[PDB]
Amino acid sequence: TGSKPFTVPILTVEEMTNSRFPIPLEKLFTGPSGAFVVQPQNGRCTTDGVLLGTTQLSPVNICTFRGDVTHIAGSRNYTMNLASLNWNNYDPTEEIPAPLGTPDFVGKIQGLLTQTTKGDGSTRGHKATVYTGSAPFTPKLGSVQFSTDTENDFETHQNTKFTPVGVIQDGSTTHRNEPQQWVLPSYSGRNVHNVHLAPAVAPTFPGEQLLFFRSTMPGCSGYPNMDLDCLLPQEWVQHFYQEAAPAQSDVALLRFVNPDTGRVLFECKLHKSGYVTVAHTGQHDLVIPPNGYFRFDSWVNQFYTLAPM
Amino acid sequence: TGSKPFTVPILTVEEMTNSRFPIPLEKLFTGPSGAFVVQPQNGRCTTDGVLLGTTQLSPVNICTFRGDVTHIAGSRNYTMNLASLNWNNYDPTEEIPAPLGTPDFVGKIQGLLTQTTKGDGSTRGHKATVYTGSAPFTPKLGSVQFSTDTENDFETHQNTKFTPVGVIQDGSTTHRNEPQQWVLPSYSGRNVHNVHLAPAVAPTFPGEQLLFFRSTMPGCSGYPNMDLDCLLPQEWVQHFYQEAAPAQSDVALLRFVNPDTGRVLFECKLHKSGYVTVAHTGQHDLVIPPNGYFRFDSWVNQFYTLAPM
Ligand SMILES: CC(=O)N[C@@H]1[C@@H](O)[C@H](O[C@@H]2O[C@H](CO)[C@H](O)[C@H](O)[C@H]2O[C@@H]2O[C@@H](C)[C@@H](O)[C@@H](O)[C@@H]2O)[C@@H](CO)O[C@@H]1O
Ligand SMILES: CC(=O)N[C@@H]1[C@@H](O)[C@H](O[C@@H]2O[C@H](CO)[C@H](O)[C@H](O)[C@H]2O[C@@H]2O[C@@H](C)[C@@H](O)[C@@H](O)[C@@H]2O)[C@@H](CO)O[C@@H]1O
């Protein structure tokens, strides 16, 4: 009826980026999800381009922090007073769960904390870890804590950046017990309810499962669970944001096509609120050809039955 | 006609990513470049979607390395035997300058070197630096060297990744003398000339300068030069690669529009071989509205006269 035609990118899975951590996608995965709550806040976008949760457009700002730091005496810990994505004042009253790009899982994220002194352009960088399950993790309040390897090198009142690399685990405890990718941090700290969240998703149609876009996070210490599943590639977020094509039903039928043959491998539902389901029962690593890609074919309804994956 | 209509993304500058290092764009910059060679190898793509140089599609696989490492006795240095993205051996006979995403400047890039032991999922991470001007920097031959902070923690024959964060400088020497963003590394080391390069670019038309998409690399030690200019945002590379719209002339005329007024701020030439020029003489940080964007207007020839920026 004259709506702007909806499309998805023709990039292959391996040509795209995880929307929950700045690393490439590796594979597609489906499994049952009744045993956990699927409520990530990064990689959330409606098909007509409305960003949700803490989702923002940059693949390299995910799980980053910016601001200035204060040393906590008697430790190697620094409190970062957060700034916005472009180094302006952070506004805690904005109707979002936390600063855009904030991590959306409980875990210990390791990276580098870097700093420049404005006056002379001197710089410094130190390995640092943020414990997103810890009491000082209060990004919505404008404050997070980093554990570092220095007690004096960082200066006050100078622009400071955290660049994430990977995750760690406490090797004296049960292996792969953290990170917990489906447990949201408490963005305002212990026992304070989160706000303005993108909703939890579940396959609501009988016989369906979520389809996840999966990567493996680097591990930096211990025995971490390095699996990371997102609902939408970052490139799909960027694509929908720009196109802003209106959803003509609750569900977009996508076909996964092998361009080498022109043949469809499977079909799936892209729900207009921004997640994908498939008709399958059980945990399964999808085996796909390297040049395979998703193609929008038609608008269907909540009552459409998918061909079994 | 019926040729596929050419477009550029409507993402704003601050919503896009530098194509030469995994950091957000900050600003537009123009300056004279007649006195030196502008020949970056990342962020090189024709308007009809042909990747050039060492350019690849991922915003987060730029200046990364992966492979396995060997310890150099009596040092904290490790040699990395490079692998491809899916962990097979790099093939030096491919007609490219170096593995795709290899750094295209001479400098000391600091980040974290991480590793997983496959047998038990144990992991480890250490601050590391690669000096792309050094004799062991031979990515085209399949080998680079890292300086780290350990002499024994990394294991042999285990998958190892370098994630870049920023750059350093030797603070006992002249400030901001490195990195040198317009000096290409020697991809095969000492005394071997580089091959299969994307060409140098220059404005030919009187009164014109290159328009650069600029970021500030994090600094991790010393007094580095942190300016980093690319010719095309990474998102434009991804866009042209997917669209593959044929060039109807040598130059796509773009207008940069201010939505708050509906008026054009400036116009520029996007050359079909993948770079932008503007009519200006001198160094200038462009002042743009946060919601400003580029819009393709028409195909013109190389000798079209732009309104002064
Ligand atoms: C039972 C038990 O505690 N296991 C230990 C494990 O804790 C050790 O890991 C080191 O622990 C320290 C803290 O005391 C740091 O967290 C180190 O980063 C960590 O080493 C890293 O992870 C381990 C699993 C190895 O992969 C190592 O190469 C990494 O540097 C280890 C140290 O050898 O011993 C027992 O496994
Ligand atoms: C005059 C002069 O040489 N300046 C020194 C400066 O070089 C020192 O910096 C350190 O140098 C060592 C190498 O010997 C390492 O590279 C350190 O990382 C480096 O410190 C870092 O950069 C300096 C400029 C500071 O920003 C510092 O905070 C960083 O950690 C310093 C040491 O403090 O002394 C003189 O400034």
XYZ file of C-alpha atoms and ligand atoms in Angstrom:
690
model
C 0.000 0.000 0.000
C 2.869 2.387 -0.822
C 4.913 1.870 2.338
C 8.697 2.226 2.067
C 9.844 -1.328 1.276
C 11.463 -3.072 4.197
C 14.871 -4.732 3.720
C 17.700 -6.296 5.695
C 21.390 -6.019 4.807
C 22.922 -8.512 2.400
C 26.069 -8.856 4.558
C 26.823 -12.422 5.543
C 26.921 -13.455 9.188
C 30.752 -13.408 9.248
C 30.751 -9.938 7.653
C 28.735 -8.506 10.594
C 29.365 -7.355 14.146
C 27.940 -8.396 17.515
C 25.688 -5.677 18.942
C 26.510 -6.531 22.562
C 30.336 -6.458 22.448
C 32.751 -5.033 19.802
C 33.678 -8.306 18.103
C 32.689 -10.024 14.877
C 29.822 -12.419 14.621
C 30.857 -16.065 14.220
C 27.728 -18.144 13.848
C 23.988 -18.629 14.262
C 22.637 -20.518 17.248
C 19.161 -21.574 18.391
C 18.079 -23.163 21.651
C 15.213 -23.220 24.158
C 15.125 -20.174 26.417
C 12.541 -21.012 29.061
C 15.294 -21.445 31.685
C 16.461 -17.831 31.419
C 15.203 -14.333 30.704
C 16.285 -12.872 27.357
C 16.316 -9.125 27.966
C 19.530 -7.664 26.519
C 19.633 -3.875 26.278
C 22.233 -3.496 23.510
C 21.367 -4.622 20.008
C 17.726 -3.641 20.449
C 15.929 -1.897 17.628
C 12.528 -2.148 16.006
C 12.362 -2.973 12.323
C 11.214 0.578 11.576
C 14.339 1.906 13.279
C 13.507 2.883 16.856
C 16.485 2.217 19.132
C 15.617 0.579 22.450
C 17.279 0.056 25.808
C 20.868 1.277 25.847
C 21.304 0.711 22.122
C 23.300 3.231 20.119
C 24.698 3.169 16.574
C 28.434 2.677 16.943
C 29.875 -0.844 16.893
C 32.988 0.401 18.745
C 31.231 2.224 21.575
C 29.638 -0.904 23.003
C 30.869 -1.619 26.553
C 33.009 1.528 26.532
C 33.001 4.210 29.255
C 34.228 7.827 29.154
C 34.649 10.463 31.846
C 37.160 11.389 34.477
C 38.477 9.462 37.415
C 39.083 9.766 41.131
C 41.417 7.479 43.007
C 39.999 5.509 45.930
C 42.669 5.774 48.648
C 44.247 2.518 49.830
C 43.420 0.645 46.622
C 44.055 0.369 42.874
C 40.444 1.344 42.259
C 39.248 4.429 40.430
C 35.762 5.867 40.318
C 34.823 7.155 36.897
C 32.420 10.057 36.771
C 30.761 9.336 33.444
C 30.522 11.675 30.491
C 28.356 11.281 27.391
C 29.490 9.528 24.190
C 31.104 12.781 22.940
C 32.634 13.926 26.297
C 29.708 16.218 27.309
C 27.912 16.137 30.619
C 26.042 12.894 31.317
C 22.304 13.360 31.991
C 20.819 10.755 34.410
C 17.243 11.953 33.778
C 17.247 10.749 30.194
C 14.608 8.056 29.742
C 17.070 5.248 29.176
C 18.231 2.434 31.470
C 21.827 3.648 31.591
C 24.291 5.528 29.356
C 24.088 4.297 25.772
C 26.385 1.361 25.140
C 26.655 0.401 28.834
C 27.279 -3.346 29.273
C 24.028 -5.317 29.545
C 25.288 -8.378 31.396
C 26.771 -9.264 34.753
C 30.413 -10.084 34.423
C 33.947 -8.857 34.845
C 35.008 -6.978 31.714
C 38.714 -6.344 31.216
C 40.293 -3.807 28.972
C 42.460 -0.713 29.040
C 41.821 2.547 30.821
C 43.557 5.388 28.931
C 43.952 9.094 29.658
C 45.268 12.278 28.103
C 46.361 15.367 30.011
C 44.898 18.323 28.128
C 47.679 20.766 28.955
C 50.670 18.946 27.417
C 49.163 15.922 25.649
C 50.882 13.416 27.931
C 49.139 10.060 28.008
C 48.900 6.899 30.064
C 47.177 3.534 29.888
C 46.592 0.701 32.366
C 44.884 -2.675 32.363
C 41.516 -2.322 34.109
C 38.448 -4.391 34.963
C 34.842 -3.366 35.584
C 32.717 -5.671 37.770
C 29.236 -5.048 36.448
C 27.680 -7.138 39.185
C 29.319 -5.088 41.963
C 27.757 -2.489 44.272
C 29.828 0.396 42.812
C 28.482 -0.393 39.311
C 26.029 2.501 39.095
C 26.231 3.807 35.528
C 22.667 5.141 35.515
C 23.726 7.336 38.476
C 26.753 8.492 36.471
C 29.377 6.474 38.301
C 31.331 3.210 37.824
C 34.418 1.718 39.461
C 37.492 0.252 37.741
C 40.082 -2.001 39.303
C 43.437 -1.225 37.757
C 47.115 -1.941 38.120
C 48.059 1.513 39.455
C 47.468 3.495 42.645
C 48.798 6.837 41.409
C 49.403 7.231 37.688
C 45.939 8.515 36.679
C 45.313 12.223 37.038
C 42.099 13.877 38.204
C 39.886 16.002 35.993
C 41.268 14.687 32.721
C 39.427 12.819 29.985
C 39.675 9.089 30.530
C 38.384 6.204 28.358
C 37.730 2.520 28.976
C 38.134 0.277 25.951
C 36.781 -3.254 26.491
C 38.718 -6.332 25.346
C 37.268 -9.401 27.027
C 36.034 -11.104 30.160
C 37.442 -12.832 33.201
C 36.385 -15.431 35.725
C 37.572 -16.307 39.242
C 39.607 -19.457 38.555
C 39.222 -20.679 42.161
C 35.503 -21.197 41.533
C 33.273 -23.351 39.277
C 34.406 -22.958 35.705
C 32.282 -20.892 33.321
C 30.121 -19.642 36.163
C 30.557 -16.081 34.837
C 29.939 -13.896 32.917
C 26.194 -14.413 33.009
C 25.119 -12.984 29.650
C 21.379 -13.087 30.377
C 21.543 -11.405 33.794
C 21.119 -7.649 33.576
C 23.229 -5.490 35.871
C 21.469 -3.245 38.364
C 22.274 0.012 36.596
C 21.542 2.132 39.703
C 23.093 -0.396 42.110
C 21.937 -3.111 44.526
C 18.152 -3.605 44.869
C 17.280 -0.580 42.753
C 14.942 -1.459 39.933
C 16.032 -0.765 36.387
C 14.022 1.649 34.222
C 13.062 2.166 30.559
C 14.161 -1.331 29.618
C 13.683 -2.880 26.231
C 11.264 -5.742 26.923
C 12.158 -9.374 27.483
C 11.679 -11.533 24.382
C 10.444 -15.053 24.057
C 9.257 -17.145 21.185
C 5.501 -16.821 21.685
C 4.431 -19.023 18.779
C 4.207 -22.764 19.647
C 7.152 -24.771 18.247
C 9.486 -21.786 17.808
C 12.826 -20.820 19.322
C 14.881 -17.673 19.303
C 17.615 -17.411 16.712
C 20.773 -15.857 18.155
C 23.676 -14.140 16.436
C 26.638 -15.544 18.354
C 30.256 -14.583 19.063
C 32.937 -15.750 21.449
C 34.312 -13.029 23.728
C 38.034 -12.981 24.420
C 38.969 -14.376 27.833
C 41.586 -12.531 29.887
C 41.860 -14.614 33.090
C 40.346 -17.716 34.692
C 37.733 -19.944 33.068
C 35.057 -17.621 31.718
C 31.878 -18.374 29.811
C 32.757 -16.598 26.594
C 29.497 -17.177 24.669
C 27.701 -14.000 23.648
C 24.364 -13.975 21.847
C 22.714 -10.896 20.346
C 19.259 -10.532 18.852
C 20.295 -8.332 15.897
C 23.650 -7.688 14.227
C 24.892 -4.145 14.771
C 24.716 -3.597 11.023
C 21.018 -4.465 11.078
C 20.494 -1.891 13.827
C 22.240 0.744 11.698
C 20.248 -0.354 8.662
C 16.814 -0.162 10.286
C 17.679 3.177 11.923
C 18.420 4.696 8.535
C 15.714 3.038 6.444
C 12.917 3.552 8.966
C 10.620 1.404 6.814
C 7.239 0.979 8.561
C 6.266 -2.540 9.682
C 3.247 -3.750 7.689
C 2.532 -6.541 10.170
C 3.901 -7.862 13.487
C 6.183 -10.323 11.610
C 8.644 -10.132 8.654
C 9.342 -13.405 6.874
C 13.032 -13.735 6.077
C 14.610 -16.396 3.903
C 18.232 -17.403 4.360
C 19.533 -17.823 0.856
C 22.682 -19.281 -0.620
C 23.653 -16.899 -3.471
C 25.917 -19.579 -4.903
C 22.778 -21.504 -5.888
C 19.901 -19.073 -5.384
C 18.347 -21.692 -3.058
C 16.710 -21.064 0.326
C 18.264 -22.911 3.304
C 15.699 -21.965 5.957
C 13.136 -19.315 6.778
C 12.631 -17.332 9.949
C 10.461 -14.630 11.501
C 11.857 -11.190 12.117
C 9.466 -9.733 14.689
C 8.857 -6.018 14.283
C 10.064 -5.343 17.838
C 13.485 -6.621 16.747
C 14.217 -10.314 17.266
C 14.242 -13.492 15.199
C 12.581 -16.901 15.680
C 12.868 -20.248 13.891
C 10.842 -23.443 13.892
C 13.134 -25.817 15.752
C 13.278 -27.766 18.991
C 16.609 -28.186 20.772
C 20.044 -26.589 20.978
C 21.644 -26.304 17.583
C 24.662 -24.608 16.041
C 23.470 -23.740 12.530
C 25.685 -24.903 9.723
C 25.584 -22.295 6.968
C 27.467 -21.600 3.772
C 29.925 -18.683 4.099
C 28.136 -16.570 1.438
C 24.655 -17.157 2.803
C 22.585 -14.093 3.727
C 19.102 -13.090 4.931
C 16.501 -11.734 2.514
C 13.153 -10.126 3.367
C 10.393 -11.789 1.366
C 7.006 -10.801 2.795
C 4.968 -9.566 5.737
C 3.228 -12.397 7.544
C 1.132 -12.732 10.663
C 1.397 -14.018 14.184
C -0.377 -17.143 12.833
C 2.156 -18.003 10.118
C 3.742 -21.461 10.420
C 7.410 -21.564 9.480
C 8.886 -24.423 7.534
C 10.970 -26.443 9.977
C 14.512 -25.129 10.149
C 18.873 4.570 -18.031
C 17.625 2.497 -15.075
C 21.055 2.184 -13.438
C 20.893 1.468 -9.735
C 20.638 4.874 -8.040
C 23.690 5.763 -6.018
C 23.352 6.809 -2.373
C 25.442 7.503 0.681
C 24.347 6.652 4.254
C 22.304 9.197 6.205
C 24.229 8.462 9.386
C 25.735 11.578 10.909
C 29.503 11.943 11.335
C 29.392 11.100 15.057
C 27.253 7.991 14.340
C 30.032 6.537 12.136
C 33.352 4.741 12.608
C 36.916 5.461 11.479
C 38.008 2.986 8.795
C 41.671 2.996 9.893
C 41.286 2.217 13.631
C 38.298 0.933 15.663
C 37.131 4.265 17.132
C 34.268 6.656 16.411
C 34.559 9.546 14.038
C 34.678 12.902 15.794
C 34.818 15.582 13.154
C 35.439 16.616 9.557
C 38.790 18.197 8.752
C 40.336 19.649 5.636
C 43.905 20.703 5.079
C 46.542 20.871 2.354
C 48.265 17.622 1.406
C 50.183 18.479 -1.740
C 53.484 18.254 0.080
C 53.138 14.598 1.016
C 51.768 11.268 -0.093
C 48.257 10.332 1.108
C 48.092 6.570 0.529
C 46.186 4.879 3.342
C 45.314 1.220 2.722
C 42.373 0.847 5.090
C 39.162 2.701 4.367
C 39.644 2.330 0.595
C 36.673 1.429 -1.544
C 35.213 2.533 -4.859
C 31.724 4.013 -4.922
C 30.531 0.886 -6.754
C 31.739 -1.289 -3.889
C 35.183 -2.644 -4.829
C 37.411 -2.894 -1.745
C 40.980 -1.679 -2.252
C 44.304 -2.011 -0.477
C 43.995 -3.893 2.808
C 40.355 -2.832 3.290
C 37.860 -5.290 4.740
C 34.284 -4.873 5.984
C 34.498 -5.150 9.779
C 34.815 -2.049 11.957
C 36.270 -4.257 14.736
C 38.836 -6.252 12.698
C 41.010 -3.218 11.977
C 44.505 -3.344 13.497
C 43.715 -6.718 15.095
C 45.914 -9.808 14.788
C 45.318 -13.475 15.499
C 47.390 -16.606 15.454
C 49.674 -18.515 17.781
C 52.678 -17.158 19.636
C 56.214 -18.182 20.421
C 58.297 -16.717 23.208
C 61.576 -15.026 22.406
C 64.085 -16.236 24.983
C 65.593 -13.638 27.289
C 62.849 -11.096 26.572
C 59.204 -10.264 27.126
C 58.647 -10.400 23.379
C 56.480 -12.861 21.465
C 56.353 -13.712 17.770
C 52.881 -14.215 16.386
C 52.461 -16.587 13.490
C 49.440 -15.021 11.803
C 46.257 -16.884 10.996
C 43.143 -15.838 9.094
C 39.810 -14.986 10.746
C 38.759 -18.620 10.844
C 42.149 -19.557 12.269
C 43.849 -21.051 9.202
C 47.344 -20.034 8.012
C 47.603 -16.657 6.190
C 48.397 -17.077 2.488
C 51.147 -14.626 1.492
C 50.634 -15.248 -2.220
C 47.313 -13.424 -2.383
C 47.711 -10.196 -4.350
C 47.116 -7.800 -1.491
C 49.675 -5.673 0.375
C 49.195 -7.470 3.652
C 46.406 -9.271 5.481
C 43.182 -7.275 5.324
C 42.916 -4.844 8.234
C 46.676 -4.700 8.847
C 47.688 -1.300 10.259
C 48.475 1.234 7.517
C 50.654 3.580 9.503
C 53.993 3.515 11.273
C 53.471 3.595 15.010
C 53.407 1.761 18.311
C 49.952 0.289 18.840
C 49.119 -0.821 22.329
C 46.345 -3.156 23.335
C 45.774 -6.541 24.958
C 47.051 -9.908 23.841
C 44.576 -12.615 24.919
C 44.602 -16.404 24.676
C 42.400 -19.412 25.390
C 43.679 -22.902 26.133
C 41.335 -25.150 24.163
C 41.626 -28.192 26.450
C 40.179 -26.614 29.604
C 39.018 -23.133 28.579
C 41.605 -21.378 30.721
C 42.362 -17.843 29.559
C 44.952 -15.079 29.994
C 45.449 -11.484 28.914
C 48.431 -9.160 28.935
C 49.149 -5.590 27.862
C 51.069 -5.691 24.585
C 52.494 -3.361 21.956
C 53.257 -3.907 18.263
C 55.683 -1.494 16.598
C 54.702 -1.378 12.940
C 57.977 0.321 11.937
C 60.111 -2.470 13.447
C 62.131 -5.085 11.542
C 60.029 -8.024 12.821
C 56.849 -6.298 11.553
C 56.367 -8.551 8.526
C 52.599 -9.205 8.273
C 52.737 -9.888 4.527
C 55.193 -12.731 5.363
C 52.842 -13.966 8.108
C 54.731 -12.830 11.204
C 54.652 -9.889 13.642
C 56.269 -9.303 17.032
C 54.669 -8.102 20.293
C 56.320 -6.662 23.372
C 54.413 -7.753 26.492
C 54.627 -7.766 30.250
C 55.277 -11.520 30.711
C 58.114 -13.930 29.941
C 56.156 -17.126 30.570
C 52.369 -16.935 30.771
C 51.483 -17.420 27.072
C 51.206 -20.984 25.827
C 52.305 -22.381 22.468
C 49.796 -23.724 19.943
C 46.818 -21.958 21.442
C 44.665 -19.367 19.667
C 45.842 -15.867 20.558
C 44.293 -12.470 19.676
C 45.527 -8.871 19.756
C 42.889 -6.240 20.362
C 44.135 -2.704 19.656
C 43.300 0.162 22.003
C 45.588 3.108 21.261
C 49.064 4.391 20.502
C 52.196 5.316 22.405
C 55.227 7.530 21.972
C 58.726 7.495 23.438
C 58.440 10.438 25.857
C 62.221 10.950 25.937
C 62.063 12.230 22.347
C 60.355 15.149 20.509
C 56.635 15.318 21.304
C 54.092 14.088 18.793
C 56.782 12.690 16.414
C 54.970 9.338 16.260
C 52.739 7.722 15.149
C 53.117 8.885 11.548
C 49.690 8.337 10.083
C 50.757 9.037 6.467
C 53.804 6.742 6.477
C 53.071 3.205 5.354
C 54.781 0.318 7.168
C 56.967 -2.042 5.161
C 54.594 -4.990 5.146
C 57.378 -7.477 4.243
C 60.041 -5.870 6.370
C 63.356 -4.333 5.629
C 64.357 -3.855 2.017
C 61.232 -5.374 0.469
C 58.980 -2.882 -1.370
C 55.237 -2.891 -0.733
C 52.979 -4.314 -3.421
C 49.355 -4.158 -4.659
C 48.694 -0.848 -2.902
C 45.617 1.254 -3.271
C 46.834 4.397 -5.080
C 47.858 7.683 -3.545
C 45.137 10.314 -3.664
C 45.323 14.003 -4.346
C 43.103 16.884 -5.309
C 43.828 17.922 -8.897
C 41.308 20.734 -9.290
C 42.443 24.276 -8.419
C 41.321 25.408 -4.975
C 40.400 21.955 -3.709
C 41.604 19.931 -0.707
C 40.826 16.485 0.607
C 38.039 16.234 3.186
C 39.079 13.903 5.977
C 36.962 11.981 8.445
C 38.897 12.481 11.647
C 39.217 10.721 15.014
C 41.504 10.944 18.005
C 43.250 7.680 18.850
C 43.569 6.936 22.566
C 47.087 7.545 23.894
C 48.569 4.962 26.269
C 52.023 6.410 27.104
C 54.259 9.359 26.178
C 53.274 12.213 23.914
C 51.813 10.586 20.800
C 50.302 12.236 17.749
C 46.731 10.979 18.110
C 45.148 12.459 14.969
C 43.776 9.837 12.573
C 42.225 10.772 9.258
C 40.390 8.409 6.946
C 39.083 8.980 3.449
C 35.767 7.150 3.952
C 33.821 6.140 7.051
C 33.711 2.390 7.587
C 29.946 2.554 7.193
C 30.388 4.052 3.712
C 32.657 1.118 2.828
C 29.964 -1.327 3.975
C 27.281 0.641 2.150
C 29.028 0.778 -1.218
C 29.997 -2.889 -0.934
C 26.339 -3.880 -0.548
C 24.760 -1.390 -2.959
C 27.336 -1.770 -5.749
C 25.672 1.095 -7.620
C 27.555 1.903 -10.846
C 29.252 5.312 -11.102
C 27.600 7.376 -13.852
C 30.491 9.835 -13.947
C 33.805 10.427 -12.195
C 32.285 12.385 -9.298
C 29.237 12.145 -7.135
C 28.233 15.618 -5.960
C 27.247 15.522 -2.275
C 25.523 18.214 -0.277
C 25.941 18.372 3.504
C 22.561 19.416 4.906
C 21.476 20.965 8.229
C 18.069 19.616 9.179
C 17.502 22.402 11.753
C 17.396 24.985 8.948
C 16.801 22.842 5.829
C 19.809 24.559 4.251
C 22.986 23.211 2.674
C 26.082 23.870 4.770
C 28.573 22.915 2.060
C 28.965 20.761 -1.044
C 31.754 18.313 -1.879
C 32.962 15.866 -4.501
C 32.940 12.136 -3.830
C 35.305 10.744 -6.420
C 34.294 7.354 -7.744
C 37.664 5.841 -6.651
C 36.698 6.599 -3.044
C 37.721 9.940 -1.550
C 36.215 13.391 -0.996
C 37.304 16.917 -1.926
C 36.078 20.373 -0.936
C 36.791 23.895 -2.144
C 38.954 25.357 0.606
C 42.512 26.581 1.163
C 44.054 26.042 4.611
C 43.652 23.863 7.702
C 40.111 23.885 9.064
C 38.108 21.916 11.604
C 34.606 21.979 10.153
C 31.880 23.143 12.510
C 28.789 21.038 11.812
C 25.416 20.483 13.480
C 25.184 17.131 15.322
C 22.315 16.042 13.035
C 24.003 17.174 9.782
C 24.262 14.574 7.017
C 25.560 13.943 3.489
C 23.126 13.596 0.593
C 23.904 12.521 -2.959
C 22.513 15.016 -5.440
C 23.920 14.318 -8.909
C 26.665 12.915 -11.086
C 29.061 15.642 -12.256
C 32.473 15.598 -13.905
C 35.840 16.127 -12.236
C 35.992 19.715 -13.442
C 32.823 20.824 -11.695
C 33.438 23.962 -9.612
C 32.304 23.681 -6.017
C 30.913 26.547 -4.044
C 33.547 27.497 -1.461
C 33.234 25.481 1.705
C 41.997 -23.244 42.080
C 42.504 -21.914 41.606
O 42.410 -20.903 42.284
N 43.063 -21.908 40.399
C 44.269 -21.152 40.126
C 43.919 -19.846 39.424
O 43.208 -18.993 40.329
C 45.174 -19.133 38.935
O 44.804 -18.038 38.091
C 45.378 -16.841 38.346
O 44.670 -16.262 39.423
C 45.132 -14.937 39.732
C 44.452 -14.557 41.053
O 45.145 -15.111 42.164
C 44.845 -13.989 38.577
O 43.436 -13.915 38.409
C 45.512 -14.530 37.285
O 45.041 -13.711 36.186
C 45.129 -16.002 37.070
O 45.869 -16.509 35.960
C 45.064 -16.520 34.700
O 44.038 -17.501 34.565
C 44.531 -18.820 34.794
C 43.369 -19.805 34.796
C 45.548 -19.176 33.716
O 44.894 -19.231 32.443
C 46.672 -18.148 33.665
O 47.482 -18.384 32.508
C 46.115 -16.731 33.617
O 47.181 -15.792 33.797
C 46.077 -20.088 38.163
C 47.368 -19.396 37.740
O 48.232 -20.345 37.105
O 46.388 -21.214 38.981
C 45.227 -21.985 39.283
O 44.579 -22.370 38.065
C 61.618 14.128 30.056
C 61.142 12.724 29.829
O 61.838 11.882 29.286
N 59.912 12.455 30.257
C 59.654 11.384 31.201
C 58.713 10.360 30.581
O 59.381 9.684 29.511
C 58.256 9.340 31.619
O 57.207 8.535 31.068
C 57.401 7.105 31.026
O 58.438 6.493 30.232
C 58.523 5.059 30.415
C 59.736 4.620 29.591
O 60.954 4.882 30.285
C 57.209 4.363 30.032
O 57.020 4.510 28.643
C 56.021 4.998 30.811
O 54.792 4.435 30.314
C 56.034 6.511 30.633
O 54.949 7.057 31.427
C 53.712 7.389 30.646
O 53.840 8.545 29.822
C 54.263 9.685 30.568
C 54.538 10.843 29.616
C 53.186 10.054 31.581
O 52.003 10.469 30.891
C 52.859 8.873 32.486
O 51.699 9.176 33.269
C 52.602 7.613 31.666
O 52.523 6.483 32.541
C 57.755 10.033 32.880
C 57.366 9.015 33.945
O 56.353 9.571 34.790
O 58.775 10.889 33.389
C 59.072 11.954 32.489
O 57.871 12.676 32.192
